[PDB]
Design a protein around this nucleic acid. Structure first.
Ligand SMILES: [Mg+2]
Ligand SMILES: [Mg+2]
Ligand SMILES: [Mg+2]
Ligand SMILES: [Mg+2]
Ligand SMILES: [Mg+2]
Ligand SMILES: [Mg+2]
Ligand SMILES: [Mg+2]
Ligand SMILES: [Mg+2]
Ligand SMILES: [Mg+2]
Lengths: 205, 134, 260
RNA sequence: CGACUCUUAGCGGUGGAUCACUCGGCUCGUGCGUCGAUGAAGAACGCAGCUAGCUGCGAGAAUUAAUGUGAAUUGCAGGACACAUUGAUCAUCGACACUUCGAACGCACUUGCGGCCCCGGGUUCCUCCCGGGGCUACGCCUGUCUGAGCGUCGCUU
RNA sequence: CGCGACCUCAGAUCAGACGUGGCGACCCGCUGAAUUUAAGCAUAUUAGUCAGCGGAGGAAAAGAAACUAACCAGGAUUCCCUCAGUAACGGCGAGUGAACAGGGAAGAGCCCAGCGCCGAAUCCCCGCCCCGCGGGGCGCGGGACAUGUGGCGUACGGAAGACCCGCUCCCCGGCGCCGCUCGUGGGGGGCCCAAGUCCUUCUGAUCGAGGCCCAGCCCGUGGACGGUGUGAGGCCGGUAGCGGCCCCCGGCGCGCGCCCGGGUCUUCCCGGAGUCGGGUUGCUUGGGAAUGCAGCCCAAAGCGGGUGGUAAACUCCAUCUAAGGCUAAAUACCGGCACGAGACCGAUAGUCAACAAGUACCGUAAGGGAAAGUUGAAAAGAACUUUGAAGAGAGAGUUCAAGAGGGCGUGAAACCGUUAAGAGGUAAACGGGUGGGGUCCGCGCAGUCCGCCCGGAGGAUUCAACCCGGCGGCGGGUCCGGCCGUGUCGGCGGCCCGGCGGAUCUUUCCCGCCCCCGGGGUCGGCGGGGGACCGUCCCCCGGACCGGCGACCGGCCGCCGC
RNA sequence: GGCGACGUCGGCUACCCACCCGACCCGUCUUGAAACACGGACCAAGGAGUCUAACACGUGCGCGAGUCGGGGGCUCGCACGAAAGCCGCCGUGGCGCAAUGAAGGUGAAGGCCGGCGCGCUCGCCGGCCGAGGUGGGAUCCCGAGGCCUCUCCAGUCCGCCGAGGGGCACCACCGGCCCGUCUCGCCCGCCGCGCCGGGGAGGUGGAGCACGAGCGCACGUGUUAGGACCCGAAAGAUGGU
RNA sequence: GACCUGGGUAUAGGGGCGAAAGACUAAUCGAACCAUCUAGUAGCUGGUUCCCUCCGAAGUUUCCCUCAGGAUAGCUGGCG
RNA sequence: GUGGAGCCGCCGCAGGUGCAGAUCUUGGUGGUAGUAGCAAAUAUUCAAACGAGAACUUUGAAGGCCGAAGUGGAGAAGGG
């Protein structure tokens, strides 16, 4: 059954696999179906924007991805609290709220607070019959378009810094080396041991 | 070219809707053209054929300037019988040979209260076709 | 072949009884009662390896080859030899990339379409399409395609303004948009060189849609047009050049046949 | 000579191959996504002027009413052509009707045997007298009526 | 001893309701093999699949954390692409084998018990009415439920009450009616282009030929099908934000019904048990010192509990809040009702089934389960004569054809009859080589050559040579008028009324801010916009070459036709 | 050069017949079949290496240190269109661009010149460069000489040219570098002087490096898993009559 | 006569029932029949469809619960 | 020659791609072959009638068999 130089293989076809096959012949028939689920939803709503509410700036987990910015679920209470808007009024403004999200940084806290005040100043509401509390005249001269596309304020916008040019100085071309990695890598793993020998000389008398 | 995606273009399903046709569809599909004198007086092209229309045959073995009335309209065999075109059998009894109404020209309609209302509706729906040319 | 021809209860007769060892159907009474059951031999059996609907029907071509073939499909529709040797009678027509002005895009009625092609001397190709109004040879007639036909000219445009309605009653004709061209329309049968009537605004847009060799395409993000493997391609001029024939030996033009 | 046998060919027979057709499949796809005690699915029987089957129907039984349509149905007869009555036919189908078995339901399944209630006539009827009509299955919920208890207790004698 | 209550329970053909069975493609709960693979076979694999059993629905199940994570952290479920044939499991053999980040589809959240608070402020049923259509009530008076706890405000994102502070008068349904509905809301009916023109073929045309310099006619209509054969125009139809009809639907405005939110501080409140968990025992899982589930035993806590993927003790940090509940979308669909199509099959195929197919028929039954399409355009289905008791003929007749005569299109081979020819004791058949006969073809038959040039013989016409008129092409030339290619630039020209590109530059520009003593310091930056520079593509003047299949005009040569 | 008219001339096939010679019946397993080995009375139609997944190698095409939209998304509501086109702040991801170790982890540039430290079997500073060397190596470069109607004076060329030179791919060898181990050894470093870090020199293990060649698509062959080229059990299991 | 026989009824598949033969249990019994799992599996029989051109073998080595088979080397062909 | 409505060449593409065998599947037909055979339970014969037609029908006569546990006369089951 084997032969000359080839691969040793484990095809997982020892199970009755012709019954559970999924063939995608309706896949153009469904791509033209859920376009119609968007178009006949977008005109169904309002001049309210398509593709739903506004999402936060959110940094990804897991060291491979922690250098980038993603759109999240909801802004949350801490960020809604500073911006001034109520936690249950926020989702009829068009702002999604995720109450189980935590803020433990302050840089990313103020990023979404700056994001959320920037949204409200480029939002125009419609009073029912024109009393207009916290709203003014004719609606931004008929609001300059009708309906937006795939994100309100371009939710990824992964941006980087300039940091143009420096001159290589002393204490910079001298010190911060490979050896500072290897010593800091050792000092993290000899940390608990060396604090145990320190107890031993304290009980030495 | 057909654009409506709810009506057939296959051979086998259009025949099956033809030979299994209901008898009220079957009077519609057994229609015959009016004569050139008479389609100018009524400005309508063709009419579903009935029992006492004066009529002449325009193609076939029996043809040519033989106005003579229909006498019996088989819908089941898609056939009118006309009182003059016949055939002697081997027995000597004479029988009506049957011909299809597409091969046949009405030369005098039989007007009743309904054949006014059919012509007027088939003629009124042509001036709106003229009114589209603006 | 839907499930199979395996909706039959049947066993081999096995032992002697002077019959083949193929499975026989059960029961008695009926004719179908001692007959050869499933197996690709039997009246009523199951076909060999019944065709499966998960066959790879569909093929990928990577898109620089799709755009490679669509630059080679347009460049041969400008050479009069290749477009006439595909059969399009383009004798009387003027200049081969035909460009009528952009007013043609607002034709709304097919009388205007017909005398257009007559005055561009391209009706004599549409009239050839009426000559191939045969019916199909073979069993494809009962699978509802009965008439074969030549494909004629293709009119390629931008900003449809009613032009699609005026030309589509004319047989054998094709209308494709200059933003979204098609290898299946421009090169029917796989052979290159279909006769085409461009419009001005379609014809100028080709420069910004495939790009020249100095500047890339603007409406296509990262595409520039493919370079040549031969620059001078008429080698009857190269081999008669004084640089070549200064260097050659001489022709050796005896025959030196077999000697008795 | 003739017969017999053999090989070719014509012509006739046996046989139903090939070819041409196709109101049938098969595959993929789209849209909807709806049974039943208010008796479903299914089964049995019956129903046409001449009708055994398939199809359609249910003692109103090859269909009724209505709306649309507007002169047929047809293998043969027969009958109303009436349509400024109501109008043949066919489709639609929203009104009515829908025998027997079946979850099948008075009890049994042997067309076997009841039990109350009312009706039309006979004893002008209670106490088992013709026909017809209504009612009578099991589970279980909320409520009602009836009432079991040396259960707990009150007021009593 | 009687009576009254209440609790536990009975009965009834009580009043009013409900459940049952089917279908089961997909979906949910259990139950569950073996063939097979390992070249044997037990663990393993097949497979938690087949069969068995129960429940649903137009979808179901899941679902708002007792999570993933371990860093700058994400944030219900479901589906896709990856992760990945990977970590892991395994006679570490055969084999098996998930997840989290990430990219997308879709996106929506909430409610109770408890803790307290409000005089049960609550619900059901009956009765007559406000007053009504197509029947549901808020309004009225009685019988129950209910304190063993109905209703309101409340849910872990915290909550409540009292302050103080600055806002504010709301939403929901029903009823009439007008105004629209993005493919232009749905359902149903009945309508809407243009040759049957002239010749012609034929059994019959839809064939073939023809229509002035307006292209014979129509075309938003040349899909299709049917009609005596191949049809844009003879006929259904198809095209069209075509018309008119009938019903049905989602949403503006008069009358009901409901209606104080937010911030700050202070005080008080704050949670689900034979459950978690541990033991052991089965199953299951990639889950390995046990992932999940289940039995039995033991059985909690409250700064607790669960989780943190190697058993344990110590510690710190992270994270979540379990043992109660609802919830749309993206998803699945070989059953159903309707549809559209196809590089499919063409009556031994394709469904078993194109037809009186789940039919005849078979088996006690479960179950098994076929054969079977084709006259012709139209029955015009062979009258009448004659032989025979009739089948069956011989004539006649219909039809283009009976050489289509009622399982009748075409009508193969095996097999058989017949006629013709040939032959025949080593069974027949065959290879090779000639011969004899035969069928038939080709030539046409002692009658076969065909075009080239020349000199002979008479005939018959007009050009050639030469020139002139005349249009058209070939080739060379100042590149002359235009012309574009490639390097060199400049006018920084069009950069501010130029395109793009650049992880070039500018802490003096311009906007919302951080770092110290109302202001201020480039005092180091942040979010955004500006304008310089470089890289490449757009015109003007010069210069460079070739004027390259990019060309026209002039003039030259030599052809050509008139 | 000669010969021949209405029955003659020529011709051949799936025609028939004669004769001489040669000749056992196919398929099959098999050392060996005409076999006293098996299958086949005869004709018609049917009838057996397929499709999907994975991989290997060859070949063809596009781009090329990159390549690839397959998953979504966009485009007026379009027969053909279930197609085609487009996206790029949709390149997430996949394979490739980096190996090695069980793991913690580490992780691929040398040669010359000038000088100095005991120029000490060891090295240090600066400059030049820049993938080391040897032997073969297609091709290309140089080339004394050679070849032309009368003799000395000059030109382009061409052919021959011993010898010499730079050497592609590739092969053999020697040396170097990275990772794991092993022996021997000495020096340096400091967000803190240690059961800390770094380096050396020789020897061996690796699927490495030594100026990238892959990726996508298509076709072919082979292997495998699947009913797997068709047909075949004696068995086994579930559920029923 | 431990007699024969009709009808009714009871016992059902690893079960029935047997004066015992592994008899009988619907022409089937050393484990019935019907359906499905199932197109079960076979190192073993049988078959495996057009022509021409070119090249053209092996039954031996080593291992294998291996001896009717496979892997491995050799022989072979194709691309170069 | 039949036949009566469709079909083919070239360039690419795609397969349910070509038969002599499989005790092959389905259908058809031969030789054997006018052959084996139309032989269990004793048996028929004469005239006539009807009829196109009589070894076989009906009738008349003769001869025979079942021989009362029947080849006689009635039923259950089953058949319909
Ligand atoms: Mg179809
Ligand atoms: Mg054919
Ligand atoms: Mg047949
Ligand atoms: Mg009626
Ligand atoms: Mg009663
Ligand atoms: Mg019961
Ligand atoms: Mg339902
Ligand atoms: Mg042999
Ligand atoms: Mg078993």
């Amino acid at each position: 059954a084997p032969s000359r130089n080839g691969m040793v293989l484990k095809p997982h076809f020892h199970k009755d696999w012709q019954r559970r096959v999924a063939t995608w012949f309706n896949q153009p028939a469904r791509k033209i179906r859920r376009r119609k689920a968007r178009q006949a939803k977008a005109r169904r709503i309002a001049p309210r924007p398509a593709s739903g509410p506004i999402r936060p700036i959110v940094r990804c987990p897991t060291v491979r991805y922690h250098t980038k910015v993603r759109a999240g679920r909801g802004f949350s209470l801490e960020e809604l609290r500073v911006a001034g808007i109520h936690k249950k009024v926020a989702r009829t403004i068009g702002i999604s709220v995720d109450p189980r999200r935590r803020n433990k940084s302050t840089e990313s806290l103020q990023a979404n607070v700056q994001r959320l005040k920037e949204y409200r100043s480029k939002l125009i509401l419609f009073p029912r019959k024109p009393s207009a509390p916290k709203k003014g005249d004719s609606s931004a001269e008929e609001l300059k378009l009708a309906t937006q596309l795939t994100g309100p304020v371009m939710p990824v916008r992964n941006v980087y810094k300039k940091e143009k040019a420096r001159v290589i100085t002393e204490e910079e071309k001298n010190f911060k080396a490979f050896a500072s990695l290897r010593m800091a890598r050792a000092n993290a793993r000899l940390f608990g041991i060396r604090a145990k020998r320190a107890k031993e000389a304290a009980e030495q008398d | 070219m057909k654009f409506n995606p709810f009506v057939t273009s296959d051979r086998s399903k259009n025949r099956k809707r033809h030979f299994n046709a209901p008898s009220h569809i079957r009077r519609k599909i057994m229609s015959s053209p009016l004569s050139k004198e008479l389609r100018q007086k009524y400005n309508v092209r063709s009419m579903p054929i009935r029992k006492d229309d004066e009529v002449q045959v325009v193609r076939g073995h029996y043809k040519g300037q033989q106005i003579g009335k229909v006498v019996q309209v088989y819908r089941k065999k898609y056939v009118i019988y006309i009182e003059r075109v016949q055939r002697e059998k081997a027995n000597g009894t004479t029988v009506h040979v049957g011909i299809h109404p597409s091969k046949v020209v009405i030369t005098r309609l039989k007007l009743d209260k309904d054949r006014k209302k059919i012509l007027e509706r088939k003629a009124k729906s042509r001036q709106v076709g003229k009114e589209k040319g603006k | 072949s839907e499930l199979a021809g395996h909706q039959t209860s049947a066993e081999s007769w096995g032992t002697g009884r002077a019959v083949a060892r193929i499975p026989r159907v059960r029961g008695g009474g009926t004719h179908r009662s001692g007959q050869g059951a499933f197996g690709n031999m039997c009246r009523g059996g199951r076909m060999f390896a019944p065709t499966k609907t998960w066959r790879r029907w569909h093929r990928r071509v990577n898109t620089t080859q799709k755009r490679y073939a669509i630059c080679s499909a347009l460049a041969a529709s400008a050479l009069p030899a290749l477009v006439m040797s595909k059969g399009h009678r383009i004798e009387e027509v003027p200049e081969l990339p035909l460009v009528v002005e952009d007013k043609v895009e607002g034709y709304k009625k097919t009388k205007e379409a017909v005398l257009l092609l007559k005055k561009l001397k391209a009706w004599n190709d549409i009239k050839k399409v009426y000559a191939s109004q045969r019916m199909r040879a073979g069993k494809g007639k009962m699978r509802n395609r009965r008439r074969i036909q030549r494909r004629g000219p293709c009119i390629i445009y931008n900003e449809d303004n009613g032009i699609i309605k005026a030309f589509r009653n004319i047989p054998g004709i094709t209308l494709l948009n200059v933003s979204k061209l098609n290898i299946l329309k421009l090169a029917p049968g796989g052979h290159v060189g279909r006769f085409c009537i461009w419009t001005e605004s379609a014809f100028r847009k080709l420069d910004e849609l495939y790009g020249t060799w100095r500047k890339a395409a603007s409406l296509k993000s990262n595409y520039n047009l493919p370079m040549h493997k031969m620059i001078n391609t008429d080698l009857s001029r190269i081999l008669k050049s004084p640089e070549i024939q200064r260097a050659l030996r001489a022709p050796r033009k005896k025959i030196h046949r077999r000697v008795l």
